[PDB]
Write an enzyme that holds these catalytic residues in place. Structure first.
Site, PDB file in Angstrom:
ATOM      1  N   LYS A  16       0.795  -1.231   0.000  1.00  0.00           N
ATOM      2  CA  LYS A  16       0.000   0.000   0.000  1.00  0.00           C
ATOM      3  C   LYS A  16       0.813   1.259   0.000  1.00  0.00           C
ATOM      4  O   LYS A  16       1.988   1.256   0.330  1.00  0.00           O
ATOM      5  CB  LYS A  16      -1.001   0.027   1.169  1.00  0.00           C
ATOM      6  CG  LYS A  16      -0.418  -0.003   2.580  1.00  0.00           C
ATOM      7  CD  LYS A  16       0.115   1.326   3.107  1.00  0.00           C
ATOM      8  CE  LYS A  16       0.628   1.229   4.527  1.00  0.00           C
ATOM      9  NZ  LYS A  16       1.421   2.435   4.937  1.00  0.00           N
ATOM     10  N   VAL A  98      10.960  -4.434   2.898  1.00  0.00           N
ATOM     11  CA  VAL A  98      10.909  -4.629   4.328  1.00  0.00           C
ATOM     12  C   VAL A  98      11.056  -3.286   5.092  1.00  0.00           C
ATOM     13  O   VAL A  98      11.992  -2.502   4.857  1.00  0.00           O
ATOM     14  CB  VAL A  98      12.045  -5.594   4.776  1.00  0.00           C
ATOM     15  CG1 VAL A  98      11.994  -5.874   6.287  1.00  0.00           C
ATOM     16  CG2 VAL A  98      11.970  -6.869   3.981  1.00  0.00           C
ATOM     17  N   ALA A  99      10.190  -3.086   6.076  1.00  0.00           N
ATOM     18  CA  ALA A  99      10.207  -1.900   6.970  1.00  0.00           C
ATOM     19  C   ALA A  99      10.181  -0.607   6.169  1.00  0.00           C
ATOM     20  O   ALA A  99      10.811   0.367   6.514  1.00  0.00           O
ATOM     21  CB  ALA A  99      11.395  -1.961   7.957  1.00  0.00           C
ATOM     22  N   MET A 102       5.104   0.278   3.265  1.00  0.00           N
ATOM     23  CA  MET A 102       4.081  -0.234   2.321  1.00  0.00           C
ATOM     24  C   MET A 102       3.325  -1.488   2.873  1.00  0.00           C
ATOM     25  O   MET A 102       2.581  -2.161   2.140  1.00  0.00           O
ATOM     26  CB  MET A 102       4.729  -0.549   0.983  1.00  0.00           C
ATOM     27  CG  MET A 102       5.421   0.610   0.318  1.00  0.00           C
ATOM     28  SD  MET A 102       6.006   0.304  -1.358  1.00  0.00           S
ATOM     29  CE  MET A 102       4.487   0.093  -2.265  1.00  0.00           C
ATOM     30  N   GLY A 105       4.615  -6.932   5.648  1.00  0.00           N
ATOM     31  CA  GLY A 105       4.301  -7.995   6.625  1.00  0.00           C
ATOM     32  C   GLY A 105       2.787  -8.208   6.772  1.00  0.00           C
ATOM     33  O   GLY A 105       2.302  -9.345   6.925  1.00  0.00           O
ATOM     34  N   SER A 106       2.041  -7.099   6.679  1.00  0.00           N
ATOM     35  CA  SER A 106       0.614  -7.137   6.690  1.00  0.00           C
ATOM     36  C   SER A 106       0.033  -7.822   5.479  1.00  0.00           C
ATOM     37  O   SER A 106      -0.944  -8.579   5.605  1.00  0.00           O
ATOM     38  CB  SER A 106       0.071  -5.716   6.833  1.00  0.00           C
ATOM     39  OG  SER A 106       0.447  -5.204   8.092  1.00  0.00           O
ATOM     40  N   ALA A 107       0.599  -7.570   4.310  1.00  0.00           N
ATOM     41  CA  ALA A 107       0.220  -8.287   3.092  1.00  0.00           C
ATOM     42  C   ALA A 107       0.384  -9.812   3.289  1.00  0.00           C
ATOM     43  O   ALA A 107      -0.466 -10.606   2.914  1.00  0.00           O
ATOM     44  CB  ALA A 107       1.072  -7.826   1.879  1.00  0.00           C
ATOM     45  N   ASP A 139      -2.608  -2.577   9.683  1.00  0.00           N
ATOM     46  CA  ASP A 139      -2.604  -2.544   8.215  1.00  0.00           C
ATOM     47  C   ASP A 139      -3.012  -3.880   7.579  1.00  0.00           C
ATOM     48  O   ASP A 139      -3.114  -3.981   6.373  1.00  0.00           O
ATOM     49  CB  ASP A 139      -1.202  -2.121   7.694  1.00  0.00           C
ATOM     50  CG  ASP A 139      -0.881  -0.648   7.992  1.00  0.00           C
ATOM     51  OD1 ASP A 139      -1.791   0.163   8.169  1.00  0.00           O
ATOM     52  OD2 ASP A 139       0.289  -0.275   8.023  1.00  0.00           O
TER      53      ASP A 139
HETATM   54  N1  LIG Z   1       6.437 -11.195   6.811  1.00  0.00           N
HETATM   55  C1  LIG Z   1       7.266 -10.148   7.100  1.00  0.00           C
HETATM   56  N2  LIG Z   1       7.748  -9.293   6.152  1.00  0.00           N
HETATM   57  C2  LIG Z   1       8.598  -8.292   6.504  1.00  0.00           C
HETATM   58  N3  LIG Z   1       8.910  -7.992   7.804  1.00  0.00           N
HETATM   59  C3  LIG Z   1       8.391  -8.722   8.817  1.00  0.00           C
HETATM   60  C4  LIG Z   1       7.538  -9.844   8.510  1.00  0.00           C
HETATM   61  N4  LIG Z   1       7.153 -10.394   9.693  1.00  0.00           N
HETATM   62  C5  LIG Z   1       7.733  -9.695  10.687  1.00  0.00           C
HETATM   63  N5  LIG Z   1       8.470  -8.704  10.155  1.00  0.00           N
HETATM   64  C6  LIG Z   1       9.161  -7.712  10.988  1.00  0.00           C
HETATM   65  O1  LIG Z   1       8.270  -6.578  10.921  1.00  0.00           O
HETATM   66  C7  LIG Z   1       9.033  -5.385  10.637  1.00  0.00           C
HETATM   67  C8  LIG Z   1       8.820  -4.893   9.204  1.00  0.00           C
HETATM   68  O2  LIG Z   1       7.423  -5.023   8.824  1.00  0.00           O
HETATM   69  P1  LIG Z   1       6.958  -4.481   7.401  1.00  0.00           P
HETATM   70  O3  LIG Z   1       7.936  -4.793   6.266  1.00  0.00           O
HETATM   71  O4  LIG Z   1       5.523  -4.919   7.285  1.00  0.00           O
HETATM   72  O5  LIG Z   1       7.019  -2.939   7.769  1.00  0.00           O
HETATM   73  P2  LIG Z   1       6.201  -1.718   7.068  1.00  0.00           P
HETATM   74  O6  LIG Z   1       5.927  -2.155   5.650  1.00  0.00           O
HETATM   75  O7  LIG Z   1       6.923  -0.424   7.305  1.00  0.00           O
HETATM   76  O8  LIG Z   1       4.844  -1.792   7.892  1.00  0.00           O
HETATM   77  P3  LIG Z   1       3.708  -0.630   8.148  1.00  0.00           P
HETATM   78  O9  LIG Z   1       3.790   0.230   6.889  1.00  0.00           O
HETATM   79  O10 LIG Z   1       2.507  -1.585   8.152  1.00  0.00           O
HETATM   80  O11 LIG Z   1       3.898  -0.091   9.575  1.00  0.00           O
HETATM   81  C9  LIG Z   1      10.467  -5.776  10.913  1.00  0.00           C
HETATM   82  O12 LIG Z   1      10.670  -5.598  12.345  1.00  0.00           O
HETATM   83  C10 LIG Z   1      10.491  -7.245  10.480  1.00  0.00           C
HETATM   84  O13 LIG Z   1      11.604  -8.020  11.040  1.00  0.00           O
END
Ligand SMILES: Nc1ncnc2c1ncn2[C@@H]1O[C@H](COP(=O)(O)OP(=O)(O)OP(=O)(O)O)[C@@H](O)[C@H]1O
Length: 299
Positions: A16, A98-99, A102, A105-107, A139
């Site tokens: 997202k 990752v982090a 977008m 992890g929620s996807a 999310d």
């Molecule tokens: N399936 C996964 N994919 C990526 N990171 C994950 C996952 N499961 C747990 N994590 C942990 O969650 C964090 C990153 O999450 P993600 O990549 O969803 O962050 P984000 O996209 O910034 O999330 P948001 O925008 O929803 O707050 C890190 O601390 C990572 O180690």
């Protein structure tokens, strides 16, 4: 190209971008317009002897494969809901950073809910999957929902909105990540400190979306977390300026960052913008995408 072996269920769930993100008080109260885009994760779930997680793609090295993974938490929650053990293997092929703001992890978590429901033919209706998603994370409901939606409460309560076109995006992934709690802590810090501006109401932005008008939409995009993400990662200002000078209608930080999103007028402009960012030495890597796309769905 998705991993779709016999017996398996593979589900695609989108990343997202927040078109609009107003942040209230002390979880934080949120008003946001989520928009699902074609940068997605694909999750293959199979019956197995034990619960397991494997990852390839973005975060191949580093995304945890234990209880830390939101997909682990999803499998446990869904298994419990239908009275079975969570004996599935979960394979995640990740294009969502990752982090990166977008909600990748929620996807992954939403995709697991959908994949298991299908795998076991559990007959869990969409409303019940929504509730489970809301338990998992703020999310996750949007990752199930997709399209474009007005999220309130803390983002889990969703009212679909019309985005009457295909919208063209470039995403610039950063070198590292940001922890969303850190970015929420920072916006509270910035507001202790000054009285910077708040977004207008979402009315005009929603109207531009309903008109399908990217040129009208662009200057109305806004994200109150952006100031916090840029405070923490000042180099993002270079990324935004670069994308804008390359031809984007507007650039915004995605959610809590540090990914930058750039709305373009056309496929061809997104071609130009992505090519120039890649050449400008201001981010790690560049992606082209479009939105809106569907929520977590079996392939
Ligand atoms: N399936 C996964 N994919 C990526 N990171 C994950 C996952 N499961 C747990 N994590 C942990 O969650 C964090 C990153 O999450 P993600 O990549 O969803 O962050 P984000 O996209 O910034 O999330 P948001 O925008 O929803 O707050 C890190 O601390 C990572 O180690």
């Amino acid at each position: 190209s998705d991993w779709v072996p016999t017996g398996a269920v593979t589900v695609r769930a989108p990343g997202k971008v927040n078109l609009y993100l107003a942040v209230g008080d002390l979880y934080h109260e949120l008003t946001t317009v989520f928009h699902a885009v074609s940068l997605a994760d694909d999750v293959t779930v199979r019956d197995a002897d034990v619960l397991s997680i494997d990852v390839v793609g973005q975060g191949e090295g580093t995304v945890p494969t234990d209880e830390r993974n939101l997909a682990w938490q999803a499998a446990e929650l869904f298994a419990d809901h239908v009275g079975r053990a969570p004996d599935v293997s979960i394979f995640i092929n990740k294009d969502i950073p990752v982090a990166g703001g977008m909600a990748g992890g929620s996807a992954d978590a939403a995709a697991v809910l959908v994949a298991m429901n299908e795998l076991w033919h559990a007959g869990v209706p969409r409303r019940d999957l929504h509730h489970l998603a809301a338990q998992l994370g703020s999310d996750v409901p949007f990752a199930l929902h997709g399209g474009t939606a007005l999220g309130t409460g803390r983002g889990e309560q969703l009212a679909t909105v019309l985005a009457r076109n295909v919208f063209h995006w470039v995403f610039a992934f950063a070198d590292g990540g940001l922890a969303t709690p850190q970015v929420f802590k920072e916006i509270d810090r910035l507001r202790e400190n000054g009285d910077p501006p708040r977004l207008a109401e979402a009315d005009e932005l929603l109207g531009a979306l309903a008109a399908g008008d990217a040129r009208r939409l662009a200057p109305l995009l806004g994200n109150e977390l952006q100031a916090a993400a840029v405070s923490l990662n000042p180099e993002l200002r270079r990324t935004l300026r670069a994308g804008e000078s390359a031809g984007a209608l507007a650039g915004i930080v995605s959610g809590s960052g540090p990914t930058c999103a750039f709305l373009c007028t056309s496929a061809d402009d997104a071609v130009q913008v992505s090519a120039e960012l890649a050449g400008a030495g201001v981010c790690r890597t560049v992606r082209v995408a479009s939105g809106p796309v569907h929520g977590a769905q079996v392939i």
